[PDB]
Amino acid sequence: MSARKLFYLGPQGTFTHQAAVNAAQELARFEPQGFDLMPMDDVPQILDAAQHGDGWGIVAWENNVEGYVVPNLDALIDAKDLVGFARVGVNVEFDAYVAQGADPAEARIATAHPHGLAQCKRFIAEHRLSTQPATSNAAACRDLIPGEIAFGPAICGELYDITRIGTAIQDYQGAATDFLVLSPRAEVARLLAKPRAEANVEYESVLTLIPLVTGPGVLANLLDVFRDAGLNMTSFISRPIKGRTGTYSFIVTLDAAPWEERFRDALVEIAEHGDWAKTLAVYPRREHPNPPVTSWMLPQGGVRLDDSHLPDDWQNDETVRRELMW
Amino acid sequence: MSARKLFYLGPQGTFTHQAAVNAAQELARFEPQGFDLMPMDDVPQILDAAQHGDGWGIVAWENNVEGYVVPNLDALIDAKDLVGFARVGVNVEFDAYVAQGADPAEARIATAHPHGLAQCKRFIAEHRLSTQPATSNAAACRDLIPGEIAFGPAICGELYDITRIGTAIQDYQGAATDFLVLSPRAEVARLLAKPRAEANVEYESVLTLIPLVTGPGVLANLLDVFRDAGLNMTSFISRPIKGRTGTYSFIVTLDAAPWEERFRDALVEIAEHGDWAKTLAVYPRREHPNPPVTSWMLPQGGVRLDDSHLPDDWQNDETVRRELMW
Ligand SMILES: O=C(O)C(=O)Cc1ccccc1
Ligand SMILES: O=C(O)C(=O)Cc1ccccc1
């Protein structure tokens, strides 16, 4: 009858804690009696407790500015019995805090994890603060005393007796981390019985593929399979297999559920070629902004030709030579 | 007549400082009068000074455990006039240090950047140390006083009056970061005149490609071009174009120089399709370990069939259903 435990990277107040709160909200219907959010010291302990069946884990997956959390990716790849079934986002915003009762004019020190101080340079500038490092942004907000300002997640203001003096004060606008919720596979299959039965098309999957061949053409031959099946991808990365340099796996995120016939037929083809395959996550399809190509702002330099009216002798232009280095 | 300046992420003692030392050695023949290694506060300042023509920059590129340094990747993508021309590695090993004259039995505190303490857990355990955070591992070794042990790069022992008591004491064996050396493009083209003239095949390139089309098949059609040209890839990642979600660029690392005819003909084809393209780096080809496929150790679970003798009704095996979630 107990609350479903949701294990996240501690301590209390981290962005991963916020992710757990968000997850508990979106997943409320799966666990009517609610969730018990439990901080853990690290990610391997989270996976272990999830895989033992004590509850669900939530782990940072991808940030749009910093990329994948590669150790988490690698750990999920090699888990014996976990799969992702929800993907939740947390905007990376830092608030500024003082110890309750402390006067902000008297703060001379900014405290946060060094990566947090790096994201709040302007604020530190504008307030003439020195910097002191903390083990985490959250620990900084926990340990606040007068004469300091801590930078941390919005959630810290809920958890500790601290006074918010600044909201979303970080330099960069628009960074966000996505997190996956993880559970043993049989449990998830059951949770997915209805959409699987309804052949619901509104799902995304994350898949790892290892063609057991090397050399030119291996990835092209693989991806032709997804093309010919009409499967759209939204993220792709190559990784070594278990840190071994010179080995190659591929992790794809696609706009399909593995029960869809086109997906099924792709995987049959890939598996019958001998490639190793594993589905790492299946979760409801997020709605992607689709800014049109004609509105895409391209990076500086580079070569771009008008495909319907090509320039003459374009291959020898000095600027082309520079950008392509040929 | 001066030393060539080499700008790296400060302060003195960082792994990036070690990378600069390594770079100065491998590149000694380009600058007979030697190098002046200059620490800078951040990467954008490094790129700026490189692009202004004050000297060369060196920036962290990819770590095998943590992946690409995505902000560095993105910054190079958008530079107006920089290209990489050397790729140097630094093994991630931490040494343990005490203030000169201090007795190691009396150390009660370990100091490092939190990511450094996280990589040296066992040592901290085995020595009954509490932990204190520092802004960087290097800063920890700089600021050493008795009763502390700092964890930092080998180079710290050269730069500060500190006594090494432990060598490569970190938990994980075998992590390494590669760094790129950057310079304006005309300068690099000149540096590459000989191998370009000799049509030297012993180079690798990093390339960013942006097909100006969306939907299924876009990447497959692109990569078919590299297949048909016999170009082998060793790394691949998708990225948003300038943080914009729903836009897509691709960054490939390949075993060819852009002057090679097969490479040239690939890029002609890609450019005449309308895709935007930019070469981010060209540098001597590193020798890749090529462990044979039959020796590849695969991750736990997953589906792998014997391609020459397939199992019967394999698509309905309970274990298959679990690993693929269909
Ligand atoms: O080819 C497709 O499926 C596309 O949508 C392009 C793509 C491919 C892989 C990652 C991101 C975008
Ligand atoms: O298809 C090839 O070129 C391969 O070598 C496989 C591959 C592709 C992309 C990144 C790493 C390996």
From TrEMBL, chains A, B:
One Gene Ontology term of the molecular function aspect: prephenate dehydratase activity
Span of domain ACT: 207-285
Pfam families to which the protein is assigned, alphabetical: PDT
Site residues by UniProt (Essential for prephenate dehydratase activity): T177
Pathway connected to this protein: Amino-acid biosynthesis; L-phenylalanine biosynthesis; phenylpyruvate from prephenate: step 1/1
Catalysis performed (reactions): prephenate + H(+) = 3-phenylpyruvate + CO2 + H2O
GO BP: any one term: L-phenylalanine biosynthetic process
GO CC field: cytoplasm
Protein name as annotated: Prephenate dehydratase
Organism whose genome encodes this protein: Bifidobacterium adolescentis (strain ATCC 15703 / DSM 20083 / NCTC 11814 / E194a)
Name of the encoding gene: pheA
